[PDB]
Write a protein that binds this DNA or RNA. Structure first.
Ligand code: MG
Ligand code: MG
Ligand code: MG
Ligand code: MG
Ligand code: MG
Ligand code: MG
Ligand code: MG
Ligand code: MG
Ligand code: MG
Ligand code: MG
Ligand code: MG
Ligand code: MG
Ligand code: MG
Ligand code: MG
Ligand code: MG
Ligand code: MG
Ligand code: MG
Ligand code: MG
Ligand code: MG
Ligand code: MG
Ligand code: MG
Ligand code: MG
Ligand code: MG
Ligand code: MG
Ligand code: MG
Ligand code: MG
Ligand code: MG
Ligand code: MG
Ligand code: MG
Ligand code: MG
Ligand code: MG
Ligand code: MG
Ligand code: MG
Ligand code: MG
Ligand code: MG
Ligand code: MG
Ligand code: MG
Ligand code: MG
Ligand code: MG
Ligand code: MG
Ligand code: MG
Ligand code: MG
Ligand code: MG
Ligand code: MG
Ligand code: MG
Ligand code: MG
Ligand code: MG
Ligand code: MG
Ligand code: MG
Ligand code: MG
Ligand code: MG
Ligand code: MG
Ligand code: MG
Ligand code: MG
Ligand code: MG
Ligand code: MG
Ligand code: MG
Lengths: 122, 94, 96, 85
RNA sequence: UUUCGGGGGUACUCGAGUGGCGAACGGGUGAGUAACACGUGGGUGAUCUGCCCUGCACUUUGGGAUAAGCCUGGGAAACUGGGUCUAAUACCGAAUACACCCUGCUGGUCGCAUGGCCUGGUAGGGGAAAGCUUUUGCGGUGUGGGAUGGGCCCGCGGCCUAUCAGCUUGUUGGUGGGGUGAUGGCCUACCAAGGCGACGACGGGUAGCCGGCCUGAGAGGGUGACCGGCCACACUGGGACUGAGAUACGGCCCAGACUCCUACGGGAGGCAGCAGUGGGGAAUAUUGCACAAUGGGCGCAAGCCUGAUGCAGCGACGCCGC
């Protein structure tokens, strides 16, 4: 559940704190974004010594969503804040260390570095 | 080779704590007075004599000191912040 | 427990040692109460000098020397005078 | 914690901490009892409780957990408070 | 003894485990700090102090348990739990103390004021030990005497800047309580309103201080290489236990950033110690040998440890000789 003008947390150490969603990707009239969906987001504020400055247009993948998302066993996900991970063209993060947990859907979505490096997978 | 329980440390009398005389200028508290001391020194570089004064506040138990009097002072244990003195005696009253 | 120390001074290729009465736990070159003798073995005879009166006073009041200090002041004769078993013997060899 | 001696003294300090905390808490409870008694305003029971507190403080001070002069100062204050009240 | 798988005593010896001692010693750096932080000068009638030496009492008695070991579980790992069981200079009572530590009543000296000293006198209450070795013998509890070590308060001193004029509310002062080894807004409550301020307060920038070094006849100016006396810190910020003694560097706990291991269930770190590597730079050394001498720790000694220290290797960088 990430839409246009959606206001998100950053779970990276790239130097950015807060991002605004730009579009949700995946197809024509793409409407919602779920865990493991690559999107495009813009940086609203950042660490002064951060790698990325505010105003950049950067591709991102959402990892922490407030809305329930079911799994194959009926497992529904309610997190506490909408967060995304800054990603580059090579399907890799821009940061080196991650805040907070992650969902299993990233593993099936081939994103291996994030799921491996996260402190715990849930 | 036995005996009782006396193996002490060393003695020490009580000696000198620095004495001074100055003028009291403010008595608007009770039981405390501020005293200005007069000090004369030759300047280390110029050598010319310079007159400088400092204000030090002491302790009195009755508030018997009025404005514009001179008294003698002795050093003591700290009693509060920024006061470390007591009053000796009032020799003159104005 | 004040002990008789040997304080290091000077530079590298010649060690220095000062027979100083001071507290034990301090630094090797730490605070010095009184200087009574100096020790330096680099020279050929390695002449040794101790102030007998102050050394005797410190031994009486209770300064405990280390074994090398005890041996050196025995060479000087301070230990012999203090204990009184042989007497006071002077055998130290003077510079040529 | 990298030396065997260091970790051994860590364990020793832990067990000393437990023992001394127990002793200190016991003395604190005795002082609390005295304070409650003097707040209530008793005389005789306060007297025997003062004797017990003085005993326990003196043993603690001779055992080194608390300084003898501080124990004496506390106990003298106890006696003075009893005298005034 | 033996079947060479090993089975018994020995204390010469000893892995690991209890119990002490050291560990706050010795070495390092100058980020913060304009402060009793530094030097000098005294101080304590207001403190304490293990190991050292030395004049002077005693060291009676009873009880229980645990590590270790054995069995077992989790788990790659660190590490832990459950059950059985053992001794001590490990642990706790009780017997003396009458010379100490407290409270109430009565003298002389000193003044520097409470009051101190003359252990003043007085009535009541309270207070500790552990033994080993048979040999140059060391231990346990207390303080009339000395010394070291500390902690605290102060006269005085020492950068620039009003293009920094008001600052402060436990702030200031008194009383009563707690507090600490010691007095104290060190902390609390109640009373009053002021203290510090143009003989530069509060603000802003810089910086460890001093004996010293260079220059200058001197005054003065510059400066803090080495050594040495203190100060402050140990990746950043805090907090506390232990102990006669803590900013506790290689002690503890927590929060951060970085790094590392994993069998993904979780753990380990702090070279500004001696060497060495990466980066910055103009650039600054060798992953060297020893306790021979001396200081330091342990032990009755023998003896053990000590990048403290002695030495060696590199570099015309400097005072000096060839
Ligand atoms: Mg004695
Ligand atoms: Mg004595
Ligand atoms: Mg030292
Ligand atoms: Mg010779
Ligand atoms: Mg020896
Ligand atoms: Mg308790
Ligand atoms: Mg409590
Ligand atoms: Mg103690
Ligand atoms: Mg007291
Ligand atoms: Mg009182
Ligand atoms: Mg053994
Ligand atoms: Mg010790
Ligand atoms: Mg230590
Ligand atoms: Mg240390
Ligand atoms: Mg250095
Ligand atoms: Mg350095
Ligand atoms: Mg500094
Ligand atoms: Mg300042
Ligand atoms: Mg000690
Ligand atoms: Mg007994
Ligand atoms: Mg057992
Ligand atoms: Mg038995
Ligand atoms: Mg008993
Ligand atoms: Mg008895
Ligand atoms: Mg009696
Ligand atoms: Mg008598
Ligand atoms: Mg015993
Ligand atoms: Mg012994
Ligand atoms: Mg002074
Ligand atoms: Mg000064
Ligand atoms: Mg008070
Ligand atoms: Mg008082
Ligand atoms: Mg105070
Ligand atoms: Mg109060
Ligand atoms: Mg000078
Ligand atoms: Mg000149
Ligand atoms: Mg000049
Ligand atoms: Mg200077
Ligand atoms: Mg030095
Ligand atoms: Mg000093
Ligand atoms: Mg720190
Ligand atoms: Mg700090
Ligand atoms: Mg610390
Ligand atoms: Mg260290
Ligand atoms: Mg270290
Ligand atoms: Mg470090
Ligand atoms: Mg080093
Ligand atoms: Mg470089
Ligand atoms: Mg060079
Ligand atoms: Mg040695
Ligand atoms: Mg022998
Ligand atoms: Mg060894
Ligand atoms: Mg060795
Ligand atoms: Mg060398
Ligand atoms: Mg060159
Ligand atoms: Mg060359
Ligand atoms: Mg030459």
């Amino acid at each position: 559940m990430i839409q246009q003008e959606s206001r998100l947390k950053v779970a990276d150490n790239t130097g950015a704190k807060e991002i605004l969603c730009i579009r949700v990707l995946g197809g024509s009239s793409r409407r919602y974004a779920g865990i493991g969906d690559v999107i495009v987001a813009t940086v609203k504020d950042a660490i002064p010594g951060g790698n990325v400055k505010r105003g950049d247009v950067v591709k991102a993948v959402v990892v922490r969503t407030v809305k329930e998302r079911r799994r194959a066993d009926g497992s529904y996900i309610k997190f506490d804040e909408n967060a995304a991970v800054i990603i580059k063209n090579d399907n890799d993060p821009r940061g080196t260390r991650i805040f907070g947990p992650v969902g299993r859907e990233l593993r099936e979505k081939k994103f291996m570095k994030i799921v491996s490096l996260a402190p715990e997978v849930l | 080779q036995k005996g009782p329980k006396y193996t002490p440390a060393a003695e020490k009398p009580r000696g000198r704590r620095k004495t001074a005389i100055g003028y009291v200028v403010s008595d608007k508290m009770q039981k405390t007075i501020v005293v200005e001391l007069e000090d004369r020194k030759s300047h280390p570089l110029y050598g010319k004599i310079i007159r400088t004064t400092k204000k030090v506040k002491a302790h009195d138990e009755n508030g018997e000191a009025g404005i514009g009097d001179r008294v003698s002072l002795m050093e003591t244990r700290p009693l509060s912040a920024t006061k470390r003195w007591r009053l000796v005696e009032i020799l003159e009253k104005a | 427990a004040v002990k008789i120390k040997l304080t290091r001074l000077g530079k590298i290729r010649n060690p220095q040692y000062r027979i100083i009465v001071a507290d034990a736990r301090t630094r090797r070159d730490g605070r010095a109460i009184e200087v009574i003798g100096r020790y330096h073995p680099k020279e050929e005879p390695s002449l040794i000098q101790i102030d007998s009166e102050r050394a005797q006073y410190w031994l009486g009041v209770g300064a405990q020397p280390t074994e090398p200090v005890l041996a050196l002041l025995k060479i000087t004769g301070d230990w012999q005078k203090f204990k009184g078993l042989p007497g006071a013997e002077g055998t130290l060899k003077v510079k040529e | 914690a990298n030396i065997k001696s260091q970790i051994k003294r860590i364990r020793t300090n832990e067990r000393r901490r437990l023992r001394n905390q127990s002793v200190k808490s016991s003395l604190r409870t005795a002082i609390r009892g005295f304070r409650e008694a003097v707040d209530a305003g008793d005389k005789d029971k306060a007297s025997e409780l003062l004797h017990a507190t003085s005993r326990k403080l003196d043993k603690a001070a001779s055992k080194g957990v608390i300084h003898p002069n501080q124990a004496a100062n506390k106990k003298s204050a106890l006696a003075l408070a009893l005298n005034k009240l």
